[PDB]
């Protein structure tokens, strides 16, 4: 009866929600944002990933393609043709020196921007996994994490090209992960509606979190570091806190059917912007779940987006191979 | 672009966007088909006849000038539902199904169901084998094989008048049996948008590759005929 | 990576001759390249420019339909052609490889180089030619510009090279501010828009040398006069 104690437990640590305890605050009238170009890949985009700069970011193609655009002048940097022609994630280093990219193969290719020779080559060829890569991210130079289709994790080591730690638990396959801030743990949600968290001293679950409906399709952290947001193919948008292990206020709205690709919060935390299977990417109040803005101007289903560091500007691409940056 | 080194830059820019048009040229006249199979089934020998925990393999051939890719899905989970997502853009799926083993048929009649109705699949051409034959016939008509056990409505049949074969009744009858049972779950439903085109493989043909190709040109043409209401 | 150069020689005046710079050891079809002339008791100048795809072709005012330049990606060969040549075309050609993308690092390799024996342009000045140095003092360099190179994006088109006295030029700090790559980390320059200083913190025996100014604003490359360190 361990889980039937965990939810007594639970039920009393819960003293209030979050509309009570927000009900005080005056909420955010209207934002209207517009976009500020168009960052015009022949098949559809499968990711993207802003760099540490605010200024480059790099996307991902089904064709087997990667671009580094110049999102000021709208000009392009690198274009790397991969040997498989299926990729789904891309990340780009923190020091700028280094991508990642993985799709439905067993690899994790790693790409040395800066050279001698003015051309980029393949540094590292990670295998060792058995299902296919749905998330790669990167925690300093040398190490690497992955999330692959095996219902498995991988933290790697670039040096040596062997693996150092293996996280397990997972039922399902995982989807998508993210990073805390101060890359000491991480969270990771899976097809078995349940997302996990892992603390890479000892590569051990250390908290689970479920009772959401459908599998998890992608996962953003708080910029504090102590909550994150989930979105899924259940046309609902969850909010989950470390500390509280409770599932606050849900963003969710009676006319909305198809399912969330991506989630993003932004720099203050104020608002919540996801994307969506209806050629949209709604923005909601963090604190009262009021649609305040809606982001049209796409004409295929959105599968990735992204604030930069700064906060200045969010690019959104789609199925159609446009990526637009609002603003 | 005022300053010296931008101009450099964006015809950097523009030189890295003159290489695309090549690529796009390349990949519009070029075909992309999927292949799907089972343990048993003979996928590995047909890949082999046209021409390491890997998860995808690939394979080119290319009849009268025209380009075919054959992406063969290999060592991956035994769920398919995720990464399916990926193949709504392919020209025909291939499936195989090996007609030899007179219980492992079930579960390729459950596989075959899911791959139909399957909606993201929806709107997708099935091209569809059968291998083993000489298998079959030498098990047909060496006896101590309970057919009609394993399929009780095996034994009130009655070839289609429609046969054309090129020896034996009872292993026609069994093979069109066979025939009928994968065309009633395509028959079942499908609203005249994707169609099946079953087939009767040895296990090497060398007109085989020849095969596809003219079923795939069949699938394009509906195509036109109903963007323009002139089917 | 290097680069090998061949020609030059003894030529009569009025005769023509051809140069080539040899790369092996990089994608040469992605580098754009320069050539720059030194004389024998004179700086630096520059001299021509080629893109990497040929599709833009600058030259210098002093000579422009003396020279022709040419490349050859099959081989991966750099051609530069003089006909009619003067008097003072008598001087040290290096061969000069430079890449422009956001964040790159120009004029980084330069070649060895081949003997040769026979108005509105922004004009930079050094205040002193030669001074005094001792081995762990701090040296400060300044360089006068006629103009302001701080442009409206914000990058401030500055480089300084720092020869050394029978070696090849190298390159120190780009866009008045980026360190290079290979420099040990005590080397540091500032500016405010027309004069410029480099600041050396420590200073070894390697330290010798011969330090340059250069803008990068508009399409003339003009340079300074030298700074010889005893």
């Known amino acids: 009866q361990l889980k039937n104690q965990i939810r007594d437990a639970r039920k009393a640590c819960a003293d209030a929600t979050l509309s009570q305890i927000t009900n005080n605050i005056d909420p955010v009238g209207r934002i209207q944002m517009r976009t500020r170009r168009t960052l015009r890949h022949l098949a559809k985009i499968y990711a993207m990933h802003w760099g540490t700069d605010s200024r480059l970011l790099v996307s991902a193609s089904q064709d087997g393609k990667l671009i580094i655009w110049d999102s000021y002048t709208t000009n392009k940097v690198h274009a790397i043709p991969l040997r498989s022609s299926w990729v789904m994630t891309c990340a780009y280093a923190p020091s700028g020196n280094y991508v990642a990219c993985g799709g439905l193969d067993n690899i994790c290719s790693i790409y040395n921007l800066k050279t001698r020779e003015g051309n980029v080559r393949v540094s590292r060829e990670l295998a060792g996994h058995t299902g296919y890569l749905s998330c790669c991210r990167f925690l300093d130079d040398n190490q690497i994490v992955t999330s692959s289709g095996d219902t498995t994790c991988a933290l790697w080591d670039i040096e040596t090209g062997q693996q150092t730690t293996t996280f397990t638990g997972h039922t399902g396959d995982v989807m998508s992960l993210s990073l805390a801030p101060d890359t000491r743990l991480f969270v990771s949600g899976a097809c078995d509606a349940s997302a996990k968290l892992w603390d890479v001293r000892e590569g051990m679950c250390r908290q689970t979190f479920t009772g959401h409906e459908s599998d998890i399709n992608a996962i953003c952290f708080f910029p504090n570091g102590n909550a994150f947001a989930t979105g899924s193919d259940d046309a609902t948008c969850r909010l989950f806190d470390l500390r509280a292990d409770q599932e606050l206020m849900t963003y969710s709205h009676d006319n909305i059917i198809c399912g969330i690709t991506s989630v993003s919060f932004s720099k203050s935390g104020r608002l919540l912007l996801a994307g969506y299977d209806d050629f949209n990417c709604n923005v909601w109040d963090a604190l009262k779940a009021d649609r305040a803005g809606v982001l049209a101007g796409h004409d295929n289903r959105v599968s990735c987006l992204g604030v930069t560091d700064d906060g200045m500007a969010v690019a959104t691409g789609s199925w159609d191979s446009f990526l637009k940056i609002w603003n | 672009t005022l300053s010296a080194e931008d101009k450099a830059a964006v015809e950097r820019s523009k030189m890295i966007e003159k290489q695309l048009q090549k690529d796009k040229q390349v990949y519009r006249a070029t075909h992309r088909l999927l292949l799907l199979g089972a343990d048993n089934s003979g996928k590995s020998t047909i890949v082999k006849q046209m021409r390491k925990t890997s998860g995808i393999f690939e394979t080119k051939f290319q009849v009268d000038k025209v380009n075919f890719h054959m992406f063969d899905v290999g060592a991956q989970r035994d769920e398919r539902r995720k990464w399916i997502q990926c193949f709504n853009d392919v020209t025909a799926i291939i499936f195989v199904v090996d007609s030899s083993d007179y219980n492992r048929l079930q579960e390729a009649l459950n596989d075959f169901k899911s791959i139909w109705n399957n909606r993201w699949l929806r709107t997708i051409s099935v091209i569809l084998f059968l291998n083993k034959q000489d298998l079959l016939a030498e098990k047909v008509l060496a006896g101590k094989s309970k057919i009609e056990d394993y399929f009780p409505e095996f034994a009130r049949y009655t070839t289609p008048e429609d046969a054309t074969p090129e020896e034996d009744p009872r292993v026609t009858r069994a093979k069109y049996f066979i025939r009928d049972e994968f065309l009633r779950i395509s028959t079942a439903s499908g609203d005249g948008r994707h169609y099946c085109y079953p087939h009767f493989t040895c296990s090497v043909d060398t007109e085989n590759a020849r095969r596809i190709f003219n079923d795939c040109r069949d699938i394009i043409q509906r195509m036109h005929l109903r963007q323009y209401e002139l089917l | 990576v290097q680069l090998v150069e061949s020609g030059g020689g003894l030529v009569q005046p009025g005769g023509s001759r051809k140069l080539s710079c040899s790369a092996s050891?990089?994608?040469?079809?992605?580098?754009?390249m320069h050539w720059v002339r030194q004389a024998p008791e004179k700086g630096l100048e520059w001299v021509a420019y080629?893109?990497?795809?040929?599709?833009?072709?600058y030259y210098a005012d002093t000579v422009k339909g003396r020279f022709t330049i040419s490349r050859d990606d099959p081989k991966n060969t750099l051609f530069l052609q003089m006909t009619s040549l003067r008097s003072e075309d008598t001087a040290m050609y290096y061969c000069?490889?430079?890449?422009?993308?956001?964040?790159?690092?120009?004029?980084?390799?330069w070649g060895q180089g081949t003997t040769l024996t026979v108005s509105a342009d922004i004009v930079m000045t050094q205040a002193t030619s030669s001074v005094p140095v001792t081995p762990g003092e701090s040296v400060s360099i300044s360089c006068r510009s006629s103009?302001?190179?701080?442009?409206?994006?914000?990058?401030?088109?500055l480089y300084w090279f720092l020869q050394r006295p029978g070696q090849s030029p190298q390159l120190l700090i780009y866009?008045?501010?980026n360190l290079a790559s290979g420099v040990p980390d005590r080397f540091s320059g500032s500016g405010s828009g027309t004069a410029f200083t480099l600041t050396i913190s420590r200073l070894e025996a390697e330290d010798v040398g011969v330090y340059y100014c250069?803008?990068?604003?508009?399409?003339?490359?003009?340079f300074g006069a030298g700074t010889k360190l005893e």
């Open positions: 103009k302001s190179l701080l442009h409206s994006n914000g990058n401030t088109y």
């Open positions: 080629i893109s990497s795809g040929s599709g833009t072709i």
């Open positions: 866009r008045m501010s």
């Open positions: 050891g990089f994608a040469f079809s992605s580098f754009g």
């Open positions: 000069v490889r430079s890449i422009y993308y956001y964040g790159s690092s120009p004029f980084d390799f």
């Open positions: 250069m803008q990068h604003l508009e399409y003339p490359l003009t």
